[PDB]
Amino acid sequence: QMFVARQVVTNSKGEKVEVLWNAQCYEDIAQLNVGFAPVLESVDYHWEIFLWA
Amino acid sequence: YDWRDDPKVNKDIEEDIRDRGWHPETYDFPYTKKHDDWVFDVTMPSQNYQTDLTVNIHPENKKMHVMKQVMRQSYWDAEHDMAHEYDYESEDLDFQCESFKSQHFRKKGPISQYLILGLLPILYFGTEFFYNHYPDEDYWRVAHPPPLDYPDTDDTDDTETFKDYKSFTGRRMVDTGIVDPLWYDIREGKKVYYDWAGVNQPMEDI
Amino acid sequence: ILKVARFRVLKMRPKISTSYRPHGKWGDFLACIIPLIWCINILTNSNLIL
Amino acid sequence: NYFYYLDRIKKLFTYLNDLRKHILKKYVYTINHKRIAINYLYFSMVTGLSGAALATMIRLELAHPGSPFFKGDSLRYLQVVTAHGLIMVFFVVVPILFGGFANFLIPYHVGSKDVAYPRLNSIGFWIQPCGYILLAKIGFLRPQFWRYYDKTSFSFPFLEKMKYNQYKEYKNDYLFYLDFLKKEITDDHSFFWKARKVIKLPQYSVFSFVPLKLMMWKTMINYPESFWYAASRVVQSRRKKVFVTKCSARTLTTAGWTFITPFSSNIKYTAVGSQDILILSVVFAGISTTISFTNLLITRRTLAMPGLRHRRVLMPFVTISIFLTLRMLATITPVLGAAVIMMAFDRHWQTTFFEYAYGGDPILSQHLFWFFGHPEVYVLIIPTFGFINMIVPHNNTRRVASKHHMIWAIYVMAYMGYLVWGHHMYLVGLDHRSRTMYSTITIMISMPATIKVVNWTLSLVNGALKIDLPFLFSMSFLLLFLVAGFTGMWLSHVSLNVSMHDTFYVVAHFHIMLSGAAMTGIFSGIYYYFNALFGVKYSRMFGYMHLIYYSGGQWVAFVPLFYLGFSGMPRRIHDYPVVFMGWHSMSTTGHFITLVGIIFFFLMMFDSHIERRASTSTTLGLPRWYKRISYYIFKIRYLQHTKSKMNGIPGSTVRLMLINRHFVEYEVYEK
Amino acid sequence: RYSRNRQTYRTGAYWCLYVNIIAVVAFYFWFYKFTMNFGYLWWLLYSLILS
Amino acid sequence: MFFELEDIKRRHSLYWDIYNVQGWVRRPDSTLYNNVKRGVTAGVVASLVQENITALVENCKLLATKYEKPQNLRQAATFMKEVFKLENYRKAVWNRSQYALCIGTFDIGARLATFRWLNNGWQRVFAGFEFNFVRKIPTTMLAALFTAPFSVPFELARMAYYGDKTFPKELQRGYSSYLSALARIPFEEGPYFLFKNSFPLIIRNFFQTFTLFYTYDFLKDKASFAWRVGEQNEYACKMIIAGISTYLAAVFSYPWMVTREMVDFWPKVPGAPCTFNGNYRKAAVWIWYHEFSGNYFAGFFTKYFWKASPGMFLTLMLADKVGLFDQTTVDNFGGAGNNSWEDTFV
Ligand SMILES: CCCCCCCCCCCCCCCCCC(=O)OC[C@H](COP(=O)([O-])OCC(O)COP(=O)([O-])OC[C@@H](COC(=O)CCCCCCCCCCCCCCCCC)OC(=O)CCCCCCCCCCCCCCCCC)OC(=O)CCCCCCCCCCCCCCCCC
Ligand SMILES: CCCCCCCCCCCCCCCCCC(=O)OC[C@H](COP(=O)([O-])OCC(O)COP(=O)([O-])OC[C@@H](COC(=O)CCCCCCCCCCCCCCCCC)OC(=O)CCCCCCCCCCCCCCCCC)OC(=O)CCCCCCCCCCCCCCCCC
Ligand SMILES: CCCCCCCCCCCCCCCCCC(=O)OC[C@H](COP(=O)([O-])OCC(O)COP(=O)([O-])OC[C@@H](COC(=O)CCCCCCCCCCCCCCCCC)OC(=O)CCCCCCCCCCCCCCCCC)OC(=O)CCCCCCCCCCCCCCCCC
Ligand SMILES: CCCCCCCCCCCCCCCCCC(=O)OC[C@H](COP(=O)([O-])OCC(O)COP(=O)([O-])OC[C@@H](COC(=O)CCCCCCCCCCCCCCCCC)OC(=O)CCCCCCCCCCCCCCCCC)OC(=O)CCCCCCCCCCCCCCCCC
Ligand code: HEA
Ligand code: HEA
Ligand SMILES: CCCCCCCCCCCCCCCCCC(=O)OC[C@H](COP(=O)(O)OCCN)OC(=O)CCCCCCCCCCCCCCCCC
Ligand SMILES: CCCCCCCCCCCCCCCCCC(=O)OC[C@H](COP(=O)(O)OCCN)OC(=O)CCCCCCCCCCCCCCCCC
Ligand SMILES: [Ca+2]
Ligand SMILES: [Cu+2]
Ligand SMILES: [Mg+2]
């Protein structure tokens, strides 16, 4: 639920960089699963969507 | 350490099979534990047999493994959560700290009140009608016909109706069939409805 | 209804919807013929009775 | 220590006090939008149960002729009907949508830490209960509280003050006080009740008929209560007849939720009491709506995330509909407030605003009320479309069909509903020019609804369907809405409207609209945001039961009402011709089926909380398969997850052999 | 951009409670003439007195 | 006075209502003897047919497992004749007829008697459809719970009798018949041998009886408009309603009976604890909370449907015929309908 895939791509400057594909939601942050574990389940429930405003 | 709280030692603790492998007390808040990964050797062999002519995969012969229960939702720790949410009034600056652990996470708690939640329509309607006796105290009571000539003749009119039915005009009307047959008999001081009248007998006068 | 219930489920024949945004411009006008006919019939009958 | 148990009890007391403080801080004094929305949802559940109880009362009264429920209380029935309508309109759908759903979703869909006015949001939440109670308990509460068998003659003489009026003059003029005292005492400081029963006893020339409870003053002197116990239900005599009046004052009634004048605005017909309470509560709810839409609109305008300040398209359809409805409410609320204030002035100060005798215009009241009333129902309905418009794409893994066109259709409906308020006043006697204009615009309104219907239908084709309970609720909502709008369009027929005005056909139409579509969309949104609201997944079994029973009850309840309307049954009538018994029984059965569906919904919530299982997103992090690479990723992860979930059940061969050789009951053996 | 905002409104909650009380009591007294008999549930009045 | 709790008896005064109908009035036919007799008759008649059908189907399967299944009508006829003349079939028919006599008299009869006792008095609306079926719901639930465990002892006795026949001569009890086995088991293994771990059977019986009786009673009155206004065939409508009722009963009852397969018959992982700890209640809870219905709905017809549904359908039809679902309906504006005749025509 954090990243749905990853790739390693060599940029024009010759350096290899990692690109991660974030999990997405259909226009609904409420439906978006905000987590910090490689888990599909929606474990974390946040009362404050924007903790730091 | 207390063995009374240890399921392995204390046999009086009823294990919940539906929560096997999930320990809410071990959650991180935010949860940062990985419990799912690539799994093979169940139906798809982990080794390589694409070009093995002498080996053919039979997925039907799937060996049974340990049941994987769905993840249990986090359970609240009352003291820890209360301490975390507690803030000192005139001793704490009004601000939000950088650390994300200060986020207020929702943790499921006691489930008893949800029984009343589920039964609320029954409870609410009972309070509305039975408890408040709405619209009146007689609507929900088992129906009883009035006693003979009770409360007054002008309202009951049992004797006059009986005489009319027993009279020539009453018999002629019954023969016509527009008027249904009499439904009660005046016994020795009491009125008794016939079993086919589909009503209870009048309540006793005491 | 039959097509959706028989083939559009993930099990049978899901379709990769690659379209980003809609592009209809006059489909509303084309569709509104039927409600237009409904309104015309209603007006005709009502006025004839009136 | 000698007080270990006491120490444990002290710890328990400290824990309880800390928990009390924590609960007060987190759920009572909090300004969090999500918590406010959850409390709004619970209050909405309570108010919906109250409305369901009122509807049950109405259906029981209408079950068969003869008033089996109210037993002749036409005024009480009218009050109950008005309470039901007002509670359902202003205190169920509005709290659900603009109270819970709006407060929960708008911050998510605009990117704001909190609403622009957290204080106003909390105030709007905490203000509802008073209005809810006022509009809900009128059926129970009457100015004439006492029942028909209460002997008020045993208590009123104590309240009478003219008895001692003679002493008032001498309390200030002592000159002739002695002469007054020298008079003859007849009834000074004494009460005498005339005989209530014929008594023939030559022995006694006078008989006592004083109340039994008032017989002895030794207990009355120190009792700090009014003398109503003596008159309260002290006689066994009763008359169980429908024609026996239960309320002496025939004017203690209500003029419905429409507030038709001069019936509503003249005390001669609707006396002081529930009518005035409803007037003031309507003004109160108007001000509450003022606060609510001010807070929400300013939140959107000032705290929307960069990039979504003006792009209405990008926001989810529910949020767009909510904002449009808030703008409509802002436009229309002052008109209703002014009309209600004028009604109050006519009732109390007798300003004769609606009295034709000296320039009053009774039809002006209807104009002003309906000008807000039709936009009110449009406000109620518009947010319901967003639920389906969001759910169908989510489960179909496909973009919604013509989102821009649907937005423009809802907008055109919203800002053209301001010129059709007279379709509720066709027969009032307005000029044919205005009548024709209203009819024409009303029939024209049908087109955007057809546009939305075709867009909904096209959203279900050529996609990856993921059947779910919200999807089934959306399908039921569409099925109900089609018939609802068709019946409304039929009502738009002027000639048919003449016969169908104030009949049960309109009742059936607007019930199929509100109770069907709005409630189905509300339940669909509830099941769509169950994880976001309660934090746990719902129970699909009780969810399916609730869906089936609720939809069936709605259909069975509100389809026979069309037959009743065609037959010609008027509205707001508790006793009707015998020829409607069957369809009224069907309607009551449908209502009870709907109640069973509500029971199933509550059991669904209870079972979901019992299960307390973490929810998993169905999209798996890939809402849209815009590319074949995304499709492959989703397929791989989905197959892996299915294998993991099936890891605990036997293989196909084992299951088949067990099923085949399960039977073990034979008689003879040894081959 | 906005400065830190207080996360609780106790005075607001109590003001709303008072608004509800005023609405209910005033409407009942003016139009129904009914005043709640606090002595019927004497233990809530005693709860106030004790508090 | 007699013990710690006192059953205080109190007298009351006269009270009456405008309407004396559409409430609860005990029918004269609702008595212990008559209700029990009708229920026993219907249950026995249904159970005989159900068990005969079960025996015939099982013997057909037994014959087909060794011989090719019929290819045409003539082959089917000879196959059926051979099944009928099979020695095992006759003994199975006799034993299962005894089992049906035991079941229909003590379980289905008890269910019908309790249902009649608790729901006879619910009058219906004259010239209308009965509303407030929520009032009947508690009665049906009470009857179902009361009569649910009346079949587990007989079923366990049957299972023990059939499982004893397949042991060697040394370890075989040697039960003469099902009745002998039932009479002997309580004194040999004890009464609890016929009730241990009875949750699957009890829940199956409850979810069968409740959702059969209540659903049939509800439908037979609510769908009556078909033959009351549409002039449809009342018997055909009742047959369709009974079919729907029995199908719903089978659907709601089979999943709970599937617990037996999951707990005992599914292979156990070597070294790991039992997935359900051998607790049928926990297995049923897992089934209830399981996401996929088909997993535990597999084998619905090959295992349970044709062993349970026909009996329930026949029981419903026989109960309707005898009159266990017949309610009393009288006009509410008639002489006995209401106590206020001054407004019935005015
Ligand atoms: C020692 C004493 C204690 C001192 C310590 C401190 C005490 C603090 C007390 C604080 C009190 C706060 C206010 C309380 C309000 C309570 C209301 C209530 O329930 O009243 C009815 C209540 C019960 O009556 P009831 O018949 O059951 O019900 C009422 C009837 O239904 C209808 O009845 P009614 O029609 O008569 O209506 C009256 C009713 C209201 O009923 C209604 O509902 C009717 C309302 C009608 C409203 C009409 C208008 C509509 C409203 C809006 C109008 C404006 C418009 C608004 C909208 C805008 C429009 C533009 O309210 C009242 O009774 C008024 C209050 C009575 C006086 C109480 C004051 C106590 C002292 C306060 C100050 C203390 C500090 C002093 C300084 C100390 C240091 C030196 O009566 C009482 O007052 C009894 C309780 C009294 C408690 C006194 C204080 C506690 C001590 C008790 C003695 C214990 C022993 C002590 C020993 C000491 C040894 C050392
Ligand atoms: C009428 C009321 C109507 C109310 C309507 C309400 C409607 C709305 C609500 C509806 C839902 C209600 C749910 C209630 C809670 C259910 C909880 C649950 O599922 O777990 C319990 C329990 C779980 O236990 P466990 O520890 O998980 O063990 C699992 C084993 O597989 C199974 O456990 P086990 O193998 O360890 O034990 C099985 C049980 C087997 O026991 C039975 O079959 C007896 C029936 C009740 C069993 C219920 C389980 C035990 C509960 C505690 C003890 C109950 C005592 C008897 C009942 C009265 C007290 C409640 O064994 C015993 O407890 C002792 C048996 C002793 C040998 C047999 C002797 C019988 C008496 C013979 C002499 C007297 C009669 C003849 C002579 C008369 C004088 C001439 O599951 C069950 O036993 C079945 C539950 C089925 C639930 C579905 C709905 C049907 C419920 C039927 C129960 C009542 C039957 C009729 C008797 C009561 C009324 C007269
Ligand atoms: C009216 C619609 C208007 C809008 C149209 C829009 C465009 C077309 C519709 C959209 C596409 C829908 C496609 C549905 C079929 C999907 C494939 C299939 O064959 O299904 C098996 C499929 C499971 O197969 P699987 O995934 O291979 O199973 C493996 C695992 O076991 C995994 O299994 P699981 O964990 O998912 O659990 C499955 C379990 C748990 O799920 C349930 O038990 C579902 C409960 C649904 C209740 C609501 C439906 C109505 C119930 C009866 C009410 C009486 C009046 C009915 C007629 C008038 C009202 C519609 O259900 C079952 O055991 C099997 C369900 C029965 C399948 C029926 C076969 C025919 C389907 C084709 C359409 C039939 C239309 C006739 C009416 C419906 C007949 C059933 O079931 C589903 O995916 C769930 C949906 C099943 C059908 C119900 C939904 C469609 C009807 C919506 C009605 C909306 C109004 C509701 C209120 C009515 C008040 C009176
Ligand atoms: C108001 C308008 C309403 C419109 C909507 C309703 C109309 C239909 C809509 C369209 C859907 C139906 C058409 C397509 C499917 C048709 C069925 C099919 O192909 O599957 C065959 C299948 C048989 O098994 P199989 O799949 O061939 O497997 C054979 C294997 O070798 C061995 O099998 P196994 O043991 O391994 O078990 C395999 C079993 C696995 O087990 C299951 O999955 C069983 C559970 C299935 C889901 C149950 C919930 C959903 C359905 C109910 C709610 C929606 C409908 C509401 C209807 C309201 C009333 C109109 O597989 C299935 O059965 C699953 C697929 C078929 C059933 C589910 C999908 C179709 C929907 C249900 C159709 C039947 C409705 C019956 C009446 C319902 C009344 C409420 O199902 C049936 O044959 C059952 C229906 C027929 C029952 C007839 C007898 C009923 C009364 C008892 C009589 C007892 C004897 C006495 C007779 C006396 C005569 C005078
Ligand atoms: C949510 C509430 C709501 C909604 C959305 C509507 C929507 C509409 N209403 Fe209604 N209405 C009410 C609630 C509502 N109404 C209430 C409560 C009253 C009475 C108030 C009172 O007096 O108490 C009322 C009264 C009312 C009247 C007065 C009747 C009378 O007094 O005699 C009229 C007259 O035209 C009318 C018309 C319409 C029209 C044209 C729509 C349009 O918006 C509908 C447009 C949609 C369509 C026309 C759908 C098109 C159909 C399909 C695409 C399906 C076709 C399929 C088949 C034919 C099989 N309404
Ligand atoms: C939203 C508006 C709404 C809703 C939902 C309903 C729902 C119902 N209504 Fe009503 N009704 C009106 C608005 C509404 N009504 C209006 C405006 C009038 C006109 C009054 C007048 O003119 O005087 C009226 C009039 C009216 C009459 C006419 C009485 C008469 O004229 O004599 C009848 C008669 O049976 C009736 C019956 C019903 C029934 C059986 C339901 C059933 O659908 C009720 C079942 C219950 C629900 C549908 C809601 C249950 C709520 C929950 C379970 C909580 C949900 C909470 C969350 C999801 C968080 N209504
Ligand atoms: C969505 C939910 C509501 C569904 C609709 C309900 C409508 C009626 C109101 C019932 C509310 C509670 C639910 C009870 C359902 C089962 C009982 C029932 O429906 O009662 C009806 C029936 C009496 O009705 P009847 O006499 O037939 O009416 C016509 C008479 N001419 O009575 C009987 O059959 C006898 C039943 C006896 C037991 C009933 C117990 C009810 C308890 C309710 C909760 C009480 C809470 C009290 C809280 C107190 C707090 C201090
Ligand atoms: C009752 C209304 C309230 C309940 C909800 C209604 C929802 C309506 C949705 C539209 C589609 C369903 C068809 C319409 C409803 C059922 C028919 C009806 O309302 O009954 C009236 C009709 C006969 O009426 P009429 O011809 O005017 O009689 C005059 C006599 N001199 O009667 C008939 O001709 C009988 C037709 C019965 C059809 C029932 C179909 C729905 C029930 C579930 C499926 C039943 C399947 C089995 C049917 C077996 C029939 C033998
Ligand atoms: Ca009536
Ligand atoms: Cu309108
Ligand atoms: Mg009118």
XYZ file of N, CA and C in Angstrom, chain D residues 101-184:
252
model
N -21.778 13.781 6.702
C -21.029 13.542 5.472
C -20.216 14.764 5.069
N -20.824 15.950 5.112
C -20.101 17.158 4.733
C -18.921 17.399 5.665
N -19.169 17.381 6.976
C -18.100 17.643 7.932
C -16.984 16.612 7.824
N -17.320 15.364 7.493
C -16.305 14.325 7.385
C -15.510 14.420 6.090
N -16.149 14.820 4.990
C -15.551 14.697 3.666
C -14.946 15.990 3.139
N -15.586 17.138 3.370
C -15.108 18.383 2.769
C -13.640 18.641 3.093
N -13.178 18.504 4.338
C -11.734 18.663 4.582
C -10.883 17.716 3.755
N -11.306 16.457 3.613
C -10.550 15.512 2.796
C -10.496 15.961 1.343
N -11.621 16.429 0.811
C -11.755 16.719 -0.609
C -11.319 18.130 -0.980
N -10.968 18.964 -0.004
C -10.454 20.298 -0.288
C -9.037 20.511 0.225
N -8.535 19.674 1.132
C -7.180 19.829 1.619
C -7.047 20.920 2.660
N -7.838 20.831 3.725
C -7.803 21.792 4.816
C -7.616 21.052 6.130
N -6.829 21.644 7.031
C -6.624 21.032 8.340
C -7.945 20.904 9.085
N -8.760 21.955 9.057
C -10.094 21.927 9.634
C -10.964 22.904 8.859
N -12.264 22.885 9.163
C -13.161 23.848 8.547
C -12.704 25.264 8.898
N -13.121 26.224 8.069
C -12.767 27.615 8.326
C -13.281 28.080 9.681
N -14.358 27.471 10.173
C -14.954 27.812 11.464
C -15.172 26.530 12.256
N -14.125 25.997 12.891
C -14.338 24.827 13.760
C -15.338 25.106 14.866
N -15.309 26.323 15.413
C -16.271 26.696 16.442
C -17.693 26.654 15.902
N -17.909 27.192 14.699
C -19.248 27.159 14.121
C -19.678 25.738 13.784
N -18.747 24.881 13.363
C -19.100 23.485 13.107
C -19.561 22.799 14.387
N -18.800 22.974 15.469
C -19.199 22.395 16.748
C -20.536 22.961 17.208
N -20.751 24.260 16.992
C -22.006 24.885 17.397
C -23.170 24.309 16.605
N -22.997 24.164 15.292
C -24.046 23.578 14.480
C -24.372 22.163 14.908
N -23.348 21.387 15.270
C -23.608 20.045 15.777
C -24.410 20.091 17.072
N -23.941 20.865 18.053
C -24.565 20.855 19.372
C -25.912 21.562 19.405
N -26.273 22.300 18.354
C -27.547 23.010 18.356
C -28.719 22.131 17.925
N -28.467 21.054 17.183
C -29.561 20.274 16.607
C -30.535 19.709 17.636
N -30.098 19.165 18.777
C -31.033 18.418 19.638
C -32.282 19.189 20.035
N -32.166 20.487 20.323
C -33.338 21.248 20.743
C -34.384 21.293 19.636
N -33.963 21.630 18.416
C -34.900 21.650 17.306
C -35.479 20.279 17.018
N -34.641 19.242 17.087
C -35.134 17.885 16.879
C -36.242 17.551 17.870
N -36.006 17.815 19.156
C -37.009 17.517 20.175
C -38.267 18.340 19.937
N -38.100 19.630 19.635
C -39.254 20.502 19.449
C -40.132 20.018 18.305
N -39.523 19.616 17.189
C -40.306 19.167 16.045
C -40.766 17.721 16.169
N -40.190 16.942 17.084
C -40.544 15.534 17.211
C -41.592 15.257 18.277
N -41.615 16.021 19.367
C -42.463 15.705 20.509
C -43.786 16.465 20.510
N -44.113 17.171 19.425
C -45.377 17.902 19.381
C -46.551 16.933 19.423
N -46.402 15.765 18.794
C -47.470 14.781 18.829
C -47.841 14.384 20.244
N -46.838 14.218 21.107
C -47.111 13.908 22.507
C -47.618 15.134 23.256
N -47.025 16.299 23.001
C -47.298 17.494 23.788
C -48.464 18.278 23.200
N -49.412 18.643 24.057
C -50.551 19.475 23.703
C -50.733 20.542 24.770
N -51.240 21.722 24.403
C -51.644 22.680 25.444
C -52.704 22.119 26.373
N -53.617 21.298 25.852
C -54.608 20.597 26.667
C -54.079 19.189 26.927
N -53.183 19.091 27.910
C -52.515 17.823 28.181
C -53.481 16.788 28.746
N -54.438 17.220 29.561
C -55.294 16.275 30.264
C -56.183 15.512 29.288
N -56.524 14.286 29.671
C -57.346 13.418 28.845
C -58.828 13.725 29.057
N -59.662 13.147 28.189
C -61.086 13.459 28.203
C -61.778 13.001 29.480
N -61.206 12.039 30.202
C -61.815 11.513 31.416
C -61.223 12.119 32.683
N -60.421 13.174 32.560
C -59.881 13.874 33.717
C -60.855 14.962 34.150
N -61.246 14.930 35.422
C -62.227 15.871 35.960
C -61.502 17.149 36.361
N -61.336 18.052 35.393
C -60.661 19.320 35.644
C -61.452 20.237 36.566
N -62.718 19.915 36.844
C -63.507 20.710 37.776
C -63.050 20.524 39.216
N -62.291 19.466 39.502
C -61.746 19.255 40.835
C -60.489 20.073 41.095
N -59.938 20.726 40.078
C -58.692 21.472 40.214
C -58.810 22.923 39.772
N -59.612 23.210 38.747
C -59.729 24.585 38.271
C -60.203 25.563 39.341
N -61.195 25.252 40.184
C -61.620 26.251 41.179
C -60.493 26.723 42.078
N -59.521 25.861 42.383
C -58.360 26.307 43.145
C -57.557 27.339 42.362
N -57.448 27.155 41.044
C -56.716 28.112 40.222
C -57.481 29.418 40.059
N -58.809 29.370 40.145
C -59.614 30.571 39.959
C -59.226 31.640 40.973
N -59.058 32.874 40.488
C -58.687 34.000 41.333
C -59.811 35.001 41.548
N -60.827 35.015 40.682
C -61.938 35.945 40.854
C -62.712 35.683 42.138
N -62.552 34.501 42.737
C -63.264 34.195 43.972
C -62.876 35.163 45.083
N -61.590 35.490 45.186
C -61.083 36.384 46.218
C -60.873 37.805 45.711
N -61.397 38.134 44.528
C -61.225 39.479 43.991
C -61.846 40.532 44.900
N -62.849 40.152 45.694
C -63.494 41.117 46.577
C -62.539 41.634 47.646
N -61.589 40.806 48.085
C -60.638 41.227 49.107
C -59.557 42.150 48.563
N -59.346 42.164 47.245
C -58.272 42.972 46.678
C -58.506 44.457 46.927
N -59.749 44.917 46.769
C -60.040 46.331 46.984
C -59.775 46.734 48.427
N -60.202 45.908 49.382
C -60.010 46.235 50.787
C -58.571 46.037 51.240
N -57.770 45.283 50.484
C -56.346 45.202 50.785
C -55.649 46.544 50.608
N -56.275 47.486 49.896
C -55.738 48.828 49.725
C -56.604 49.917 50.337
N -57.912 49.699 50.469
C -58.827 50.665 51.074
C -59.405 50.036 52.338
N -58.863 50.425 53.490
C -59.282 49.872 54.771
C -60.525 50.549 55.339
N -60.968 51.661 54.748
C -62.026 52.461 55.356
C -63.259 51.620 55.668
N -63.700 50.801 54.711
C -64.897 49.984 54.869
C -64.572 48.505 55.052
N -63.348 48.185 55.477
C -62.978 46.788 55.672
C -63.802 46.147 56.782
N -64.041 46.881 57.872
C -64.868 46.347 58.950
C -66.294 46.095 58.477
N -66.855 47.028 57.705
C -68.196 46.824 57.166
C -68.235 45.602 56.257
N -67.200 45.417 55.437
C -67.139 44.232 54.588
C -67.079 42.959 55.425
N -66.274 42.964 56.489
C -66.194 41.797 57.360
C -67.526 41.515 58.038
N -68.312 42.554 58.311
C -69.607 42.390 58.958
C -70.679 41.836 58.022
N -70.312 41.378 56.829
C -71.280 40.836 55.885
C -71.616 39.397 56.273
N -72.326 38.696 55.394
C -72.710 37.309 55.615
C -71.784 36.398 54.821
